[PDB]
Enzyme design. Structure first.
Site, PDB file in Angstrom:
ATOM      1  CB  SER B  94      39.542  40.219  37.302  1.00 10.16           C
ATOM      2  OG  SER B  94      40.823  40.287  37.408  1.00 10.16           O
ATOM      3  CB  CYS B 256      43.743  46.729  41.297  1.00  8.08           C
ATOM      4  SG  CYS B 256      42.436  46.053  41.603  1.00  8.08           S
TER       5      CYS B 256
END
Lengths: 340, 346
Positions: B94, B256
């Protein structure tokens, strides 16, 4: 920083702010509620605490404030994404639990009486305590009453339906759920909430309500759907703006509903009922006494439930966070989140 | 209040609006002697599911944010290791959460802060992530991540849908697997007013894709399946607009990082991005990352790239959670009102 104890009552989160709470202008708790709901600094504070990234679409923040009545252990006001509110059973249970388990109020066993000052009045809470744990709390709720039974309203989606307008520490519209062609269960959480938000908008626009003796408490806070389970429990689903369900059975809503039962001859002094939320969590609901509010027939309800301290949190009161104004989105906050 | 209680201590951080809670104390021992082993374990062992559920679902967790478990570093060059816990599963990688972890490590002083810059090497199940942090007066101002090798599997994979007909997606890897979808194909634009509808579409597509399109990293078997459907567009100023949709149904608040890494591999394959290029990406809420193409490389003989992701972390609080398996709701729960349309599968 603000210091919070993170508590849930039958699955409904109540964060209890026990340290670093700012001074909230007002000489009474009702005045503080009014200030929170009208002053820009009140809005700023609430938004900072309840909206993303500091807050979540579930739970309330309970601000502990200085007590004014000499018999009160603390005062509090409930912060939610819609507004500050006067009253809440699940949050009163969280506050009681936090006060006792933190030691801010001294724990006595087997019972401790804790007195909470709210904008609606004093809530007397009897906590069953054992071995340093506040196991459950029985609230004596403020005097609750019917405003009007069997109010009809026209809806484009479900035609004409009837609701009860009533007070259990804040104002409710109570709706038999069969009228909107749904049932109360987990699988219907989103659709029940959608219906509740449509009804709340319609009701708030067309049905003003105010407490006859407490001007700071006004408007229908929530639409609560109700039904009856096979074992006789009062099944509830309270819908909360901008669109989520109460995880608890709803103490204030049950208090208001109990006033409707009493008016219909369906509940009498001494009766005890079970109430069950959308997730199957439970409260005991009691009719302690009859009384009057400004000439209206009224009751004194009791609400019994359990609180569970699950953590501690500290939030930096840094108004330079790039996201200090707070935000919300319709993915997780519900269909009216765009209005935040 | 917590006297006598077993707790996990967390630093609550957000990165461009996306919450990464960073567990810095009281993390239980997670079985495995590599981070990839620990990720597999979390995703397969019953005790792993129990722990994740306890931390991420109601009443302890919310439908937004992740919980990052800090774990002992194994690789000699790593300062720390971590794994990301979400409502769907544990994830290897992530961008936003690596930024949150770096910020928390440096501001807490667990890793020593040097000014003007500190390099923190984070070990993930996908490989090492170099986090280059700009630091001043005890604050980690922003973090440039060198992400793991990112690559294309296939561009313009066709898929039949009942709602939108046949649409195209890129299958690709940015530290986890993505399906990237030009958002015009579903007749929506990326904006806050479309959050619920974008997520609904993302969930329909994720279910269809996970059922019919298996993927596995050719060298790291613990990393498999399309994690997310990310919708993409290009704003008027040229920013790469994104909306990553996450099971059981919410949008990433950040642009993202792993999704941009995967998208950058697709741009490279299309001849639209070269070593040295830098792009801006913007999320559904208008928050922004810088996305760079640092180098070309190979993954198992396939063409790949080394992307960089730059964003800001901000520590907003501290929290402690009691590890109490006797709470009546220790199993955790979710509902479709706030958790999205697939919450009933939790």
């Amino acid at each position: 920083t603000i210091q919070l104890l993170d508590v849930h009552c039958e699955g409904e989160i109540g964060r209890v702010a026990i340290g670093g709470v700012p001074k909230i202008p007002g000489n009474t708790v009702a005045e503080q509620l009014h200030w929170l709901n009208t002053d820009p600094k009140g809005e700023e504070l609430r938004r900072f605490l309840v909206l993303e990234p500091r807050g979540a679409p579930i739970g309330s923040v309970n601000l502990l404030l200085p007590a004014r009545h000499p018999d009160a252990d603390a005062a509090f006001i409930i912060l939610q994404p819609d507004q500050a509110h006067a009253s809440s059973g699940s949050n009163s249970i969280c506050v009681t639990t936090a006060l006792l388990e933190s030691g801010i109020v001294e724990m006595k066993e087997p019972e401790t009486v804790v007195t909470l000052e709210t904008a609606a009045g004093l809530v007397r809470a009897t906590a069953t305590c054992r071995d340093g744990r506040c196991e459950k709390v029985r609230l004596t709720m403020v005097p609750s009453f019917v405003h009007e039974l069997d109010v009809g309203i026209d809806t484009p989606q479900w035609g004409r339906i009837k609701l009860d307008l009533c007070y259990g520490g804040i104002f409710y519209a109570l709706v038999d759920v069969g009228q909107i062609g749904l049932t109360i269960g987990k699988a219907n959480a989103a659709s029940l909430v959608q219906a509740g938000m449509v009804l709340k908008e319609l009701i708030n626009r067309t049905v003003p309500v105010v407490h006859p003796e407490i001007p700071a408490i006004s408007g229908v806070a929530y639409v609560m759907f109700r039904d009856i389970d096979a074992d006789g429990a009062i099944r509830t689903c309270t819908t909360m703006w901008p669109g989520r369900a109460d995880r608890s059975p709803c103490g204030t809503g049950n208090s208001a509903n109990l006033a409707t039962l009493h008016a219909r001859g369906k509940a009498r002094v001494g009766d005890v009922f079970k109430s069950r939320s959308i997730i199957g969590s439970e409260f005991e609901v009691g009719l302690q006494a009859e009384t009057e509010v400004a000439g209206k027939p009224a009751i004194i309800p009791t609400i019994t439930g359990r609180g569970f301290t699950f953590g501690l949190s500290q939030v930096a009161l840094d108004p330079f966070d790039p996201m200090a104004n707070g935000f919300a989105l319709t993915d997780v906050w519900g269909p009216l989140a765009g209005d935040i």
